[PDB]
Amino acid sequence: HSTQETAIGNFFSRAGLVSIITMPTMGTQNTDGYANWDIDLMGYAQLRRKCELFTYMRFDAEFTFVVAKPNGELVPQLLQYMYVPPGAPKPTSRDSFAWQTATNPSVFVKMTDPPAQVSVPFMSPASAYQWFYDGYPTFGEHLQANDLDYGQCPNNMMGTFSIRTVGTKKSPHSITLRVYMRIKHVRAWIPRPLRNQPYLFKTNPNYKGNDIKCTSTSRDKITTL
């Protein structure tokens, strides 16, 4: 009866979906062939409820990039995916200068090419990540306009993703991207109770007050089963 399965290494060594980047030809949001994505792990529920078990966490990540058309088909189209550290230039178009990647890391991958993996170290200026930050990172008087700043840890903003179709012209194919994360070399501190309520937002743990759900399943009488 070995305890290896219950270790935090094997529990976080699974890979899961952090975000989905969509880049269509026709539409509203990204029609130009480039998509900027701010880094957040809170987008999807399953991977979030594992990380919210603990408070502080120190880990290295391995990302996998799955590119396909929204119907599943694959076409020979070339793509560039770069990492913009905090404070760098963000490209305003696909022909801009920010794509010269003279510093920022970039990746050249095709659609028929097997997915791309990269190892990302622990770059936080603190000793560990904290998803729960109680306080106001600003100073001075705190009004209701800046109240949105509650629970915002400046140490957890690691950059912005960027991806484009490689070329001057526009490609007829609409691409969608599914990014995955595998937590490895993980350390943990201060466990917390898991969240029984449905998620609402990314940045703060708001729960619907009328939707409050009893954790256990109700029954008729406590003397019967």
């Epitope: 026709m26 539409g27 509203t28 029609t31 130009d32 012209k169 526009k170 007829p172």
Partner: antibody, heavy 109, light 107 residues
Framework: EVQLQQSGPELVKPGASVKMSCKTS????????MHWVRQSHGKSLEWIGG????????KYNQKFKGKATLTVDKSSSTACMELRSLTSEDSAVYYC????????????? | DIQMTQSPASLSVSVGETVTITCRAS??????LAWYQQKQGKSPQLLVY???NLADGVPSRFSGSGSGTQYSLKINSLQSEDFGTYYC?????????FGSGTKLAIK
């Protein structure tokens, strides 16, 4: 079935600002994009920029990006554009026309 | 930025003849064409979109066709209310660009 009414002709000295208004009806205002088009002499046309009236979504022409802004009031239905630092060659008739559902393409009807 | 040029600039034709106007793009859009009719002192009106399908309220005398870059618009048979300038548009890349215009007079 769909009517778009604009403001009246306006005259201003160079250097000041101007704000137009475009009011529509006959359809759900939040589900259709709107564009602005300028007609200079004689037949020449240009594309100012679009707007998506849910919260805000904006696309400007790279030439007109600095000389024009786009705002939309979602309560009372209107579309207003504002121009900064007018000059002699900026005088033209301006059009506002509805786009396609959830799309900037599918040219204005 | 894709540019488009129409030919001819001014086409004079009497009533009852076929008229073919063209629109050419620098890049191959394949999906996007819009022909407009602007009368004198009036707002533009859409005629044929997607290079083929005619819009609502447009008579059946207008048949557009084309593929790739070069496109065309054929009018048969011309009537007396169809005089005016014509334009062509691309949906493909921002900015949306318009042609130079083609004036249609009576011979």
């Amino acid at each position: 079935e769909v009517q778009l009414q604009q403001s009246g002709p306006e005259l201003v000295k160079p250097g000041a600002s101007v704000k137009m208004s475009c009011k529509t009806s006959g359809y759900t205002f939040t589900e259709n994009t709107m564009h602005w088009v300028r007609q200079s002499h004689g037949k020449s046309l240009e594309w100012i920029g679009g707007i998506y009236p849910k919260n805000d979504d904006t696309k400007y022409n790279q030439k007109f990006k600095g000389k024009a802004t786009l705002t939309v009031d979602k309560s009372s239905s209107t579309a207003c554009m504002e121009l900064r630092s007018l000059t002699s060659e900026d005088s033209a008739v301006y059009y506002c026309a509805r786009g396609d559902y959830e799309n900037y393409f599918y040219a204005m009807d | 930025d894709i540019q488009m040029t129409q030919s001819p600039a001014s086409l004079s034709v009497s009533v009852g003849e076929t008229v073919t106007i063209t629109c050419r793009a620098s890049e191959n859009i394949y999906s996007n064409l819009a022909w407009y009719q602007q009368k004198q002192g009036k707002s533009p009106q859409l005629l044929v979109y997607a290079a083929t399908n005619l819009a609502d309220g447009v008579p059946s005398r207008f048949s557009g066709s084309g593929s790739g870059t070069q496109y065309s618009l054929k009018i048969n048979s011309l009537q007396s209310e169809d005089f005016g300038t014509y334009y062509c548009q691309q949906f493909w890349d921002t900015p949306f660009t318009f042609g130079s215009g083609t004036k249609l007079a009576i011979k």
